[PDB]
């Protein structure tokens, strides 16, 4: 009973978190095997970030300039290199707490858990969605860069995000663990803006199914619609177009509730045009779009 | 930047989670030193929970009836006893991953992180508040009993909650780690209802301060009020009366924003009587009351 935004257990990731310092700049690194991954702008001074030439800046750095601390123990840097927007610092010691892991570039509309860290020390965990405009809405202060986002299946940790920067709208941007940014963002302190923040339509429907499973059903009506009809309404409110693949993905939720996807679409169409009328769904007064269909099935089945 | 509901890193607690089985009933236990704590209704059959005599039921149980599994390794039970509504199973092995810990009975209006578990395996982490009616709004399925709530200061884990039961409204009830329920609830399958769900007024103000810190300030007005005046408005909407101790607790947030507590109270008074007018605060369309003043300061300062 109950439906909550719930992150993965962070124990496997806490053991990989270290501190990386270059001059006066300190952020977080990810220690897996004998490599520490961190944002490359650790090598920037405050004046460098206006228009940094990372190639030229990294040339005057040596291994001994990268201070890597795992708790109270200093690690010995024996190599360094740049891969896109991340630095890889080779250390002489493999992380004994390295879990089975992979690097994945997550798709927009998918979710992951963030372990927010400061000075190599975990601070807290929360869920984020990779929004269609390739930003996330998290909680990151100064020094939180290098905090990572991840998913867990069984016992393998899939790292998908590392935090780099914040945008004027208050949203956040970063890279995958290969150093490639999500979206068009670049790691310089220049005027950058996130595009239109479109809503993840399939996720809203999954969350409406979660509400029905949890006993909330005031928003169900006697109506149905079609994909083309609903998408005409989804366009005005900047919702993503719903596809048959989205319908099939919602199959498990439609089968458990007995509510056909297009019937649920008619409910969402009425919620978009008429509003909620001061009522709530799963304790929210707006439509939630950061729960994937997998998130709903996982939480409502207890995996 | 950004403000999110964020749980504590769960690594220290994951290492204490075990599975406890009695007959066909399986739930979670908390393994600290050589004792495993679990809800006492593990000894109940489905027919027992209607009106269980736990004393009489525990008499026909022996140590070898309690199956305790830590991962894939079975633990040897050498003693058992009842303390209020929890059982304490003594095992012949101390948990090598036992963190520094304490048992605390949390006050209503305070928050804690929940590690939801099934069959002794962590499933996810999320924040809950101990509501004034001594219920929490979490995410617990069958088999989730024995999952614990906790806080962390520096490196000491303060266990404050263990899950026992769910109420017809969809809310959740449990005990402290001494087995004493929060609120008037009893561990039997009888008609039980949560009382009036009053709002944690000091927490709403802390969350309004968090919004101001994060750039949201559309709800600020040119007005002020008094404690007695605001409390006349807090009564109609079932808000807790605000006290000078609440004002002092909000001191750090009032000082950082420069907005006097009573000025913020005038904003909340207008939000209660006029609503939000379709606008949002920190991405929410209603007033959040599950962030303590400490939660706001911690997240906005990066502890
Ligand atoms: Cl809301």
């Amino acid at each position: 009973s109950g439906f909550r935004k719930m992150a993965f257990p962070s124990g496997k990731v806490e053991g990989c978190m270290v501190q990386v310092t270059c001059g006066t700049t300190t952020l977080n690194g990810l220690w897996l095997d004998d490599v520490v991954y961190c944002p490359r702008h650790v090598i920037c001074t405050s004046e460098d970030m206006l228009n940094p030439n990372y190639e030229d800046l990294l040339i005057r750095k040596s291994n001994h300039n990268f201070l890597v601390q795992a708790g109270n123990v200093q690690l010995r840097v024996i190599g360094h290199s740049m891969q896109n927007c991340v630095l890889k610092l080779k250390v002489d010691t493999a992380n004994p707490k390295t879990p089975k892991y992979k690097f994945v570039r997550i798709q927009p509309g998918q979710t992951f858990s963030v372990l927010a860290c400061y000075n190599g020390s975990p601070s807290g965990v929360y869920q984020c969605a990779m929004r269609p405009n390739f930003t996330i809405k998290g909680s990151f202060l100064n020094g939180s860069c290098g905090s990572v986002g991840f998913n867990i299946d069984y016992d393998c940790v899939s790292f998908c995000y590392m935090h780099h920067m914040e945008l004027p709208t208050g949203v956040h941007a970063g890279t995958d663990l290969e150093g490639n940014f999500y979206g068009p963002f670049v790691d310089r302190q220049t005027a950058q803006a996130a595009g239109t923040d479109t809503t993840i339509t399939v996720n809203v429907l999954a969350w409406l199914y979660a509400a029905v499973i949890n006993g909330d059903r005031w928003f169900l009506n006697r109506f149905t619609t079609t994909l083309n009809d609903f998408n005409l309404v989804a366009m005005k409110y900047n919702y993503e177009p719903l596809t048959q693949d989205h319908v099939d993905i919602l199959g498990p939720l439609s089968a458990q509730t007995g509510i056909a996807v297009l019937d649920m679409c008619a409910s969402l169409k009425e919620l978009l045009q008429n509003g909620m009328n001061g009522r709530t769904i799963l304790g929210s007064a707006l439509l939630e779009d950061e729960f994937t269909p997998f998130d709903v099935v996982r939480q409502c089945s207890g995996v």
Side-chain angles (χ1 to χ4, degrees), chain A residues 1-153 156-216 218-234 236-297 299-303:
Chain A
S1 64
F3 195 75
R4 295 290 312 280
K5 206 182 280 263
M6 185 183 331
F8 282 106
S10 57
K12 298 174 158 49
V13 177
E14 296 169 44
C16 307
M17 288 316 306
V18 299
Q19 172 186 273
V20 181
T21 299
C22 210
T24 184
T25 304
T26 302
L27 43 67
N28 307 281
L30 187 69
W31 184 23
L32 303 159
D33 303 328
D34 63 350
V35 179
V36 170
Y37 308 78
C38 72
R40 67 172 174 174
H41 73 256
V42 69
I43 69 172
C44 294
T45 80
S46 292
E47 198 198 336
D48 283 337
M49 305 162 165
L50 270 309
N51 174 50
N53 190 320
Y54 286 101
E55 289 65 29
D56 284 359
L57 290 164
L58 192 62
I59 289 147
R60 57 209 191 61
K61 302 294 172 143
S62 312
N63 293 327
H64 70 266
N65 296 133
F66 297 96
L67 298 172
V68 182
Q69 205 173 306
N72 208 52
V73 170
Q74 205 75 20
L75 303 186
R76 186 171 301 273
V77 182
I78 48 174
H80 67 272
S81 65
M82 215 167 33
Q83 175 174 20
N84 302 305
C85 293
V86 298
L87 290 179
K88 294 186 287 186
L89 313 178
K90 212 221 199 192
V91 289
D92 73 353
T93 301
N95 183 358
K97 313 184 177 173
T98 301
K100 322 161 262 193
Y101 72 97
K102 295 161 19 200
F103 292 164
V104 304
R105 196 181 168 75
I106 216 172
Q107 288 291 302
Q110 295 301 114
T111 54
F112 56 87
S113 305
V114 166
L115 181 62
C117 296
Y118 294 92
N119 295 292
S121 282
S123 171
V125 229
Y126 52 84
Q127 285 285 99
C128 288
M130 177 49 74
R131 299 207 63 72
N133 69 359
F134 296 108
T135 69
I136 71 180
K137 302 181 291 185
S139 177
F140 297 102
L141 295 167
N142 205 7
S144 67
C145 286
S147 294
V148 295
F150 64 96
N151 281 281
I152 301 176
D153 40 50
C156 176
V157 183
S158 285
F159 296 106
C160 61
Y161 180 81
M162 155 177 303
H163 186 59
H164 281 250
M165 82 192 277
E166 97 176 28
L167 293 162
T169 38
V171 302
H172 304 113
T175 66
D176 60 20
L177 266 297
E178 287 188 329
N180 284 309
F181 263 96
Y182 290 96
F185 311 112
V186 289
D187 53 348
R188 29 193 83 231
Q189 184 176 319
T190 67
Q192 290 179 72
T196 311
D197 189 16
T198 78
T199 303
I200 310 156
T201 310
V202 69
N203 283 8
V204 179
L205 297 165
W207 170 79
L208 291 175
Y209 278 113
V212 162
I213 292 159
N214 273 277
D216 288 346
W218 63 260
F219 51 87
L220 298 181
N221 54 40
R222 305 168 154 285
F223 314 147
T224 200
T225 186
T226 74
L227 277 180
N228 288 346
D229 183 46
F230 170 82
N231 282 328
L232 277 183
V233 153
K236 148 183 188 98
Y237 295 89
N238 283 329
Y239 270 53
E240 292 191 305
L242 208 67
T243 66
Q244 183 57 216
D245 288 314
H246 293 147
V247 168
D248 292 341
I249 277 146
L250 293 158
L253 296 180
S254 179
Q256 146 165 29
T257 61
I259 305 170
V261 173
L262 290 176
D263 292 8
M264 192 49 90
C265 284
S267 296
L268 178 53
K269 176 174 136 193
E270 300 296 322
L271 294 169
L272 287 169
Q273 310 186 284
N274 299 34
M276 292 219 181
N277 280 288
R279 312 185 263 261
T280 59
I281 299 175
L282 284 174
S284 168
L286 40 73
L287 301 164
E288 289 313 317
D289 80 333
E290 299 220 342
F291 289 108
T292 68
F294 177 67
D295 293 344
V296 175
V297 173
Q299 201 178 139
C300 298
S301 79
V303 316

